[PDB]
Design an enzyme around this catalytic site. Sequence first.
Site, PDB file in Angstrom:
ATOM      1  N   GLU A 101       0.800  -1.214   0.000  1.00 23.73           N
ATOM      2  CA  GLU A 101       0.000   0.000   0.000  1.00 23.73           C
ATOM      3  C   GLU A 101       0.835   1.267   0.000  1.00 23.73           C
ATOM      4  OE1 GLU A 101      -3.975  -1.607   2.118  1.00 23.73           O
ATOM      5  OE2 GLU A 101      -2.571  -0.607   3.405  1.00 23.73           O
TER       6      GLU A 101
ATOM      7  N   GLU B 273      -5.904  -7.137  -1.476  1.00 22.41           N
ATOM      8  CA  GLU B 273      -6.252  -7.097  -0.054  1.00 22.41           C
ATOM      9  C   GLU B 273      -7.600  -6.406   0.143  1.00 22.41           C
ATOM     10  OE1 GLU B 273      -3.239  -5.870   3.120  1.00 22.41           O
ATOM     11  OE2 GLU B 273      -4.934  -4.624   3.601  1.00 22.41           O
TER      12      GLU B 273
END
Length: 358
Positions: free
Chosen positions: A151, A263
Amino acid sequence: PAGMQAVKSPSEAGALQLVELNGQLTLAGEDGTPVQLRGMSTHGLQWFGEIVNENAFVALSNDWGSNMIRLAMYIGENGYATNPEVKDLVYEGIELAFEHDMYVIVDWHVHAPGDPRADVYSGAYDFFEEIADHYKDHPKNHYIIWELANEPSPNNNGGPGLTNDEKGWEAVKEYAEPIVEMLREKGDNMILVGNPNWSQRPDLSADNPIDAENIMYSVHFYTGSHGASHIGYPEGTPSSERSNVMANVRYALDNGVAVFATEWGTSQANGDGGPYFDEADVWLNFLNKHNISWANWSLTNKNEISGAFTPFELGRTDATDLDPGANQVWAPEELSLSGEYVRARIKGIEYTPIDRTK
Ligand SMILES: OC[C@H]1O[C@@H](O[C@H]2[C@H](O)[C@@H](O)[C@@H](O)O[C@@H]2CO)[C@H](O)[C@@H](O)[C@@H]1O
């Protein structure tokens, strides 16, 4: 169950590739037919690495029906940068995925800080080079999927964060192009590349993609926080207005790149609240309809809503053991509300939750 024809195991699907289907790029197996992967993400291997065990991987492949697993190797937050031994779990995990017929996402879990170019992540190129070298001539090498930066985000815990815009995407692109090139020198394995704002921005990637084969771009969503939408952005909408994560996925696919939900969770993005199951339904129907592979967060018995396993709670429960034992199944009550729902969604069975009173 029915409607599971695309969720093929690696022994059947073979080397993954991207093919144009309905004018959009989609994941496909060796023969060109669409393939969708569904499975689970470990929590950080430095905190909950005990999930990488034989019986758990057999359980997740057979009892839960997963044809993929994701290995989240944090680097900061006491991961790989300070305890290198966490890498041993990545290897063990690949070996078990090989053995139990699951594709395996090796994830360099960029997180705190959110800029992938930060000093703490300086081992990235060598890490990927090392693992790819180890496995390049293995007959099961094509099971491996590389995820270069979990991320990208503004998180500045331990170094710089990134902005939510073109500058932010160009920073990730800058980070990834060297590593992509070296990994393409070793093989053709799919490479999944994250993007700004906690990988909510595949649309930025669609506007300025990496010039290489088999590159897919991440979307991450938590159903307690990222609202579903059916209106796609108007033709010509500038990136400054593209804030809705579902519409950002639609934009990426409509603008020619492939997407992988590496995710997602059933809680809010702040980690807890819910679970939010009617919105997770809408989201997974959206993913499944568009052949976007997905990994649910996470395989932990920590006491947080996204955790898949029952936690210790003094008055009521003991924590589920992350090794299910010789029967290789975790019983329904050893699954948390989230785990029980996600197992049914990976399997493609009806959701029939147990009564948690009795
Ligand atoms: O319990 C282990 C560590 O958890 C960290 O929180 C995690 C959270 O559990 C995950 O769901 C995901 O959101 O990442 C969080 C932060 O990386 C917590 O911050 C650590 O202090 C704990 O040691």
